[PDB]
Amino acid sequence: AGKRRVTENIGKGHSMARVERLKTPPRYAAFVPFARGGRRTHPPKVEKIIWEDINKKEKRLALMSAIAATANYDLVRARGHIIDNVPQLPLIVVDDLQKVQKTRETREIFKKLGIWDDIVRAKEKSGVRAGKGKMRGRRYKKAKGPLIVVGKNEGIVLGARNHPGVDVVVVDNLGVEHLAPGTHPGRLTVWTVSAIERLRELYG
Amino acid sequence: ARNKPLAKKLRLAKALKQNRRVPVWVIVKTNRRVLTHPKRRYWRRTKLKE
């Protein structure tokens, strides 16, 4: 880019700067980073290293800390989640939740549990963002709500997929960003008995 | 110039037919968007390619 132009330098003598210029009329300057249409001085390069490495033990410790912070009332409230009607933290539910595969049934269950207010909050806080991301397909900046962690997927993913800000994750695939979106820990989480047992087995 | 080959004469004929203004109905249809084409020529200023 900017390097396809054939130029010749006028040199000294003429009352002009010694700049590469085209050999055809009207003989504009070219190829130099300060000329219109020329190459950029230091453009982005595909060879740049962007991947960041983290030790496995450090990642495991961070995941354990995030899981622990999930059960803190102060952190969950300070993050922004609505837990006014939440019975207790952490919220443990029977394994029957994993078999629900209808969104209306999931909505009724969530209303009974007390996270429907958080779902409504996520829907209300989602909206159109500012900037050029709308051109590139990022028009909406959606918020995050309750996170459902289960020991086995028996239709709960399909049942609760469509709820705003709601993610259903199997315990074996749980990550740090699932529990602390945007580097902010204290996400409202709903665990199952099987998930708690798998947590006891793994201890991390 | 007095003596001309047929192929060169035909090429000159094509250039002569090309050299004309954009139709008024074309301008109306395009809503003052298409006003000219890059093949306009003045015989004494802009010369032919051949």
Partner: protein, 120 residues
């Protein structure tokens, strides 16, 4: 009919350069409640013989027949939805088919009846 890409550029490019057989489908309008109950279908492409009621814009609540359909511009002309020129001549207002609801259907076409049978 199948726009899998979620990129706005590709969606708008498909909309702008859609072929005519796709622009045919892209001109559907919702039916009235009575017609929906009668035919078990939700919407149909707008024909000329149809009678519609305008639901949005300056002519909301006005009912009239369809007099012209432009697939290229994605527009329809409804009788009575007119503007006055400075010299006193009537002109039609182009209305997107999504802003109207069909209240009377022109079912003289066996292929249109086949569409209804397929979708019911």
């Amino acid at each position: 009919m199948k726009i899998s890409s979620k990129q706005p550029r590709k969606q708008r490019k498909f909309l702008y350069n859609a072929p005519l057989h796709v622009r045919q489908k892209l001109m559907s309008a919702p039916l009235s409640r009575e017609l929906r109950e009668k035919y078990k279908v939700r919407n149909l492409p707008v024909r000329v013989g149809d009678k519609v009621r305008i639901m949005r814009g300056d002519y909301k609540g006005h009912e009239g027949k369809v007099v012209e359909v432009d697939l290229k511009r994605y527009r329809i002309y409804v009788e009575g939805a007119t503007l006055r020129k400075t010299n006193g001549t009537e002109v039609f207002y182009p209305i997107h088919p999504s802003n109207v609801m069909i209240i009377e259907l022109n079912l003289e076409d066996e292929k249109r009846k086949k569409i209804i049978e397929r979708r019911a």
